[PDB]
C-alpha cells in the first residue's frame, strides 16, 4: 500500500476515534522505512499514546480495586487476574513502539529535534513498562527509561532553545519520571525549575507562533513544582 493513502486513512481513523486503526496505519507507514515527516511522526505518536493510554487508565482502575478488596477473597483474586491481562496488553503495545523506535525512527532521524522527540518517546514507553514491571525487572526498566530521557536531554540542551515545546515537554515528562518512578522529589523539582527558568529567560526572543504551546507546557512544569513542594 501507498504511504499517502495510509496517512489519509490514519487521519480518518483519528477523527472517528478509532485509535487501534490509526496506530496500525501509522505502524505500516513506519515499517516501509522512509524517515517520517513531522506530520506523520505526530500521527504515529497520537495513535500510540491513545492505544497505550486506554490500558494505563484501565490498569489504574483495576489496581485500585485490587488494593481496596484486601479481605474480599473472590474480588481481589479476580481483580489480580484482570490486572495481569491488561498488563500483558500494555507491555505488548510498549514493546511494539519501542521496536519501531529502535529499528526505524531513531536511526532515521536526520535532525536533533526529531532525535529528541523519539528518545523522549523511548523514555516514556520504558516509563509505562516500569509502572507495571515485575519486582525483579523493575530496576532494569527504570534505568532504561532514565538513560533514554537523559540522552534526549543532553541533545536538547545543546541543540534546542529552552523555549522549544519538544525540549519543554521532555523536561515535563522526565521530571515526572523522577518524581513518580525514581521517587526523587529533589531531582524532579530541580529539573522542572531549571527548565522553567531557562525558558523564562528566552521568552523575549520566542516567535509568536510558539507562544501558546511553550507557555502552556511552562505552566504545567510550574503546576508540578507547586504540587511537589507542598
Amino acid at each position: 500500500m501507498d504511504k499517502n493513502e495510509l496517512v489519509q486513512k490514519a487521519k480518518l481513523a483519528e477523527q472517528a476515534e478509532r485509535y487501534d486503526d490509526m496506530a496500525a496505519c501509522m505502524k505500516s507507514v513506519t515499517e516501509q522505512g522512509a524517515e517520517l515527516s513531522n506530520e506523520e511522526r505526530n500521527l504515529l505518536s497520537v495513535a500510540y499514546k491513545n492505544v497505550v493510554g486506554a490500558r494505563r487508565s484501565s490498569w489504574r482502575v483495576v489496581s485500585s480495586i485490587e488494593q481496596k478488596t484486601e479481605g474480599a477473597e473472590k474480588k481481589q483474586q479476580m481483580a489480580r487476574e484482570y490486572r495481569e491481562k491488561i498488563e500483558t496488553e500494555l507491555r505488548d503495545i510498549c514493546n511494539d513502539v519501542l521496536s519501531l523506535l529502535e529499528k526505524f525512527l531513531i536511526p532515521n532521524a536526520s535532525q536533533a529535534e526529531s532525535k529528541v522527540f523519539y528518545l523522549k518517546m523511548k523514555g516514556d514507553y520504558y516509563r509505562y513498562l516500569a509502572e507495571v514491571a515485575a519486582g525483579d525487572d523493575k530496576k532494569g526498566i527504570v534505568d532504561q527509561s532514565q538513560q533514554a530521557y537523559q540522552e534526549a536531554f543532553e541533545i536538547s540542551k545543546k541543540e534546542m532553545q529552552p523555549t522549544h515545546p519538544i525540549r519543554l515537554g521532555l523536561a515535563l515528562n522526565f521530571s515526572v519520571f523522577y518524581y513518580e518512578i525514581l521517587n526523587s522529589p529533589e531531582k524532579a523539582c530541580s529539573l522542572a525549575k531549571t527548565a522553567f527558568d531557562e525558558a523564562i529567560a528566552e521568552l523575549d526572543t520566542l516567535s509568536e507562533e510558539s507562544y501558546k504551546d511553550s507557555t502552556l507546557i511552562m505552566q504545567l512544569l510550574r503546576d508540578n513544582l507547586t504540587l511537589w513542594t507542598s
Binding site: 505526530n42 497520537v46 499514546k49 515535563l172 515528562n173 519520571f177 504551546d213 502552556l216 507546557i217
Partner: peptide, 10 residues
C-alpha cells in the same frame, strides 16, 4: 497537533 503528540505527563 504537537502538544497532543508530546504525550505530556498530566
Amino acid at each position: 497537533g504537537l502538544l497532543d503528540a508530546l504525550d505530556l505527563a498530566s
